[PDB]
Amino acid sequence: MIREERLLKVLRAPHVSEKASTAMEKSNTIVLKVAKDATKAEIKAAVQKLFEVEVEVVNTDWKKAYVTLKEGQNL
Amino acid sequence: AAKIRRDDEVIVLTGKDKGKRGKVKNVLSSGKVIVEGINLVKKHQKPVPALNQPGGIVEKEAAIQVSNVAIFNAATGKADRVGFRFEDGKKVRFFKSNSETI
Amino acid sequence: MKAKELREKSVEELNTELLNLLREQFNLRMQAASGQLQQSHLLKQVRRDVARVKTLLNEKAGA
Amino acid sequence: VLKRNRSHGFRARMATKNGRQVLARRRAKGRARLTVS
RNA sequence: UGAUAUGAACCGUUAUAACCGGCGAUUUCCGAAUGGGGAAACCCAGUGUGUUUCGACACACUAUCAUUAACUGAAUCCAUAGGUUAAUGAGGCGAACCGGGGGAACUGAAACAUCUAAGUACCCCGAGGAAAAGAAAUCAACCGAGAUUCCCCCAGUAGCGGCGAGCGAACGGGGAGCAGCCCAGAGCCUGAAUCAGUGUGUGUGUUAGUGGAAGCGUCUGGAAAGGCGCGCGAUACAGGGUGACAGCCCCGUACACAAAAAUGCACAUGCUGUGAGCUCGAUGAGUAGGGCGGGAGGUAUCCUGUCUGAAUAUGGGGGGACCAUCCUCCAAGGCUAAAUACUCCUGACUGACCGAUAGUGAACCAGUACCGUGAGGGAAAGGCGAAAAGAACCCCGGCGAGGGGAGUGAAAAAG
RNA sequence: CUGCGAAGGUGUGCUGUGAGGCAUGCUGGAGGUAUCAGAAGUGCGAAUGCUGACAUAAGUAACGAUAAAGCGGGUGAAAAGCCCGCUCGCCGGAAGACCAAGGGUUCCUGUCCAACGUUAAUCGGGGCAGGGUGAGUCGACCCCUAAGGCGAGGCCGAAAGGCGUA
């Protein structure tokens, strides 16, 4: 099985910007860079495992994803 | 295999301050050493708005050539050359002229 | 530390390799990007550790 | 762009031996841009 | 913890820092690119197995040509061709020299174009690490010599050409080199020597190095390597960096020394394999001669399309032919050390060649900027100081540039 | 010989018929030179000789609606054309806007700006940097079908190909 290391490779880096900060503090969403393909299912699974958090939904040259967390958040 | 090291008592052989003793602070890869209290240079430090604002004139230490200093014998009160010898398989430094271990 | 994990079994050494990547590697990168990582030498240290663990897995597993 | 590549491109040069010699001469001279692309 | 390039965050201090050398793992996309295609760094692959998640994950193999093996097998009964699978090997790029297959102009002449330039420039294929050649159907007309190539004499000779410009020998002598075998096919006798491949041990050598003596002081000067007076050493005053021209402030040379692993050059030993003497045949069993066409031209010698058929140490061929006198010489399979040739890369050494419009195009972030569809040709630009602490504060001005003070430095006609 | 100051360069003086050399001041601050010889990439007024060096010509593109301009304020080295406030004149069943096709970083923020031998531009779409395209129920692609096109047999034709079913 190679789903594991695939999840370790879809995330690339987090995006930092005033819109990103505003989204995090208001809507509890974190925006981060992802792989070129980085389908929503893979992004959701990767965030679950690596950050051990719960995500409401993910909506997505480079690709960025606005990962939405539930009420409980860590980082 | 360097004669001058991090902590050594050395005496200047040549320059404007020949004869004054001192302790080496660090040695540069370019065959230069920094010894405090002899090679004072008045550097006009440009002010900066960063966390540090010393400005004014600073009294820094200017590096000198390794060959310009020698290890002080501390027993004969004069400069002396230093060589290497193997003892119990460990390389050590030793003076000349009644050579004794450091 | 280089020989400390040289006598570890594959399962446990695979686990610490997992932990090295999950914690202290992903978290550090977020802190550095966000700017709260005062000390950067951790990124160098963790990356070398991951490489050191990874080579042992290949050296042990298979050949 | 299309005509330029199809006339002096890498694949065009390698198709025939003389173009292959041209690439060899460029490599010997150590030109940064071996061909047009 | 590469440099440009300061600082901060880290690692190391009685033996896992960095750097150098050797042995491994790993090595994506693009380029001989092997699954296909196209406009080189762009998209798209198939099959089988495991994957805690039955929407997955990861990796190997698979092109064409030649050889070998296995399965199937025509047209046209068997054979054979084609197709499938597995293993091995061949393919591309980068100097010089040499070999094989082909092939020019300009420069030359008072116009018989051929002869010279020229078996050259350039282009194509393969091998070696030197290549080709390399143990006489050869020289000498009966003194002798005995493999090939290159250099130095004979020799700008003897010859050859509208005997015009040009091109250009052998034999003999003097050196280096001076070590040759097997197959046209066998009877008898064998762990019989040497040589090869695969290992160990000893000696030596290559790819990081250690130890390593020896000048103190004074005058001018901001600063001393030189001057004056006074020593030691010399197997070492070879060179460069080293505040002004340094043996003895240092880094080094000569002499004496080192090997975990890998590799190269001599011996011995263990295993496997190839292999000596005493004798008997043959002298390449469709290999000539003659006939026809072309080149080196009516024509000596060499190579071959097709159609026949005897020999060869017994016998067959050559420059002053004569019982094809005599002597010498054996003609259509490979291999053949070394002398002779060549320098794109490393280390050491050499220098009356060169010193920034020089030398290679580049002493340098120059195989660049720039010009062109592409190929190709191909710039300008070297030096502040021992240490860049590089400029606090204040004045004019625009919170610049530039200029005028102060401070640092021996010097600011070094900013 | 040599830091009480080398060579080169800039002046003066002496000597030889001519090429020059020796002795100095100033500038400059790091090595230089004679006699007896040898080795030649050694001396310059022109070869349309070669590269910079007194020179006669200055870096910012839209002159093609007979609906209408002017006054004020702010910024600027510049104001008949931009921004803000007060009016008039067109369109207003579109000279609005939202989709398909076509076009595919031009639309969103800070800037090369005291200007060569006297260059005097009314446009904040320019070259070089940073951001936005967020989806179960917007739509397409995924499933089935006609025409057109293609496609192992059969039907038409001595083969193949075409027509044609799955």
Of the candidates B10, B102, B101, B100, the one whose C-alpha atom is nearest the C-alpha of residue B64 is B10
The torsion region of residue B98 among left (phi > 0), alpha (psi -120 to 50) and beta comes to left
Parse chain A into domains and list their residue ranges: 1-75
Q: Is C27 on the interface with A (CB under 8 A)?
A: yes
Q: Is C43 on the interface with A (CB under 8 A)?
A: no
* Number of compact structural domains in chain C: 1
Of the candidates A36, A58, A63, the one whose C-alpha atom is nearest the C-alpha of residue A47 is A58
Q: How far apart are CA A24 and CA A18, in angstroms?
A: 10
A22 touches strand F (CB under 7 A): no
Helix (H) or strand (E) run with residue A65 in it: strand A63-69
Q: How far apart are CA D5 and CA D2, in angstroms?
A: 5
Contact (Cβ atoms closer than 8 angstroms) between residue B68 and residue B14: yes
Of the candidates A26, A24, A66, the one whose C-alpha atom is nearest the C-alpha of residue A47 is A66
Of the candidates B16, C16, B55, B91, the one whose C-alpha atom is nearest the C-alpha of residue B102 is B91
Q: Is C29 on the interface with A (CB under 8 A)?
A: yes
D26 is written with which tokens?
């460029």
Residues 53-72 of chain A in contact with strand F via CB under 7 angstroms: 57-60, 64, 66
| Residue B34 C-alpha from the chain's centroid | 5
Give the method used: cryo-EM
Residues of A within 8 A of C27 (CB-CB) are 75
Place of tokens 């003793």: B21
Contact (Cβ atoms closer than 8 angstroms) between residue C46 and residue A28: no
Per DSSP, the three-state class of B4 is coil
Provide, in whole angstroms, the distance separating residue A43's CA from nucleotide E9's C1'. 33
Please list, in sequence order, all residues whose beta carbon lies within 8 angstroms of the beta carbon of residue C51, skipping any fewer than 6 positions away: none
Q: What is the CA radius of gyration of chain A?
A: 12
Mark out chain A residues that contact chain C at CB-CB < 8 A.
8, 11, 13-14, 16, 49-51, 75
Q: Structure resolution in Å?
A: 5.3
Domain of C37, in residue numbers: 2-61
Sign, CA dihedral B39-B42-B43-B49, equals positive
Residue C6, min C-alpha distance to chain A (Å): 23
Q: Tell if the CB–CB gap between A14 and C27 is shorter than 8 Å.
A: no
Q: What is the CA radius of gyration of chain C?
A: 13
Residues 16-35 of chain D in contact with strand E via CB under 7 angstroms: 17, 20-22, 24-35
Of the candidates A73, A74, A39, the one whose C-alpha atom is nearest the C-alpha of residue A58 is A39
Q: How far apart are CA A44 and CA A59, in angstroms?
A: 10
Q: How far apart are CA C37 and CA C30, in angstroms?
A: 9
Verify D-A touch: 3 or more CB pairs within 8 A: no
Place of tokens 């700017």: C35
Instruction: Identify the CATH homologous superfamily for domain A1-75.
Output: RRM (RNA recognition motif) domain (3.30.70.330)
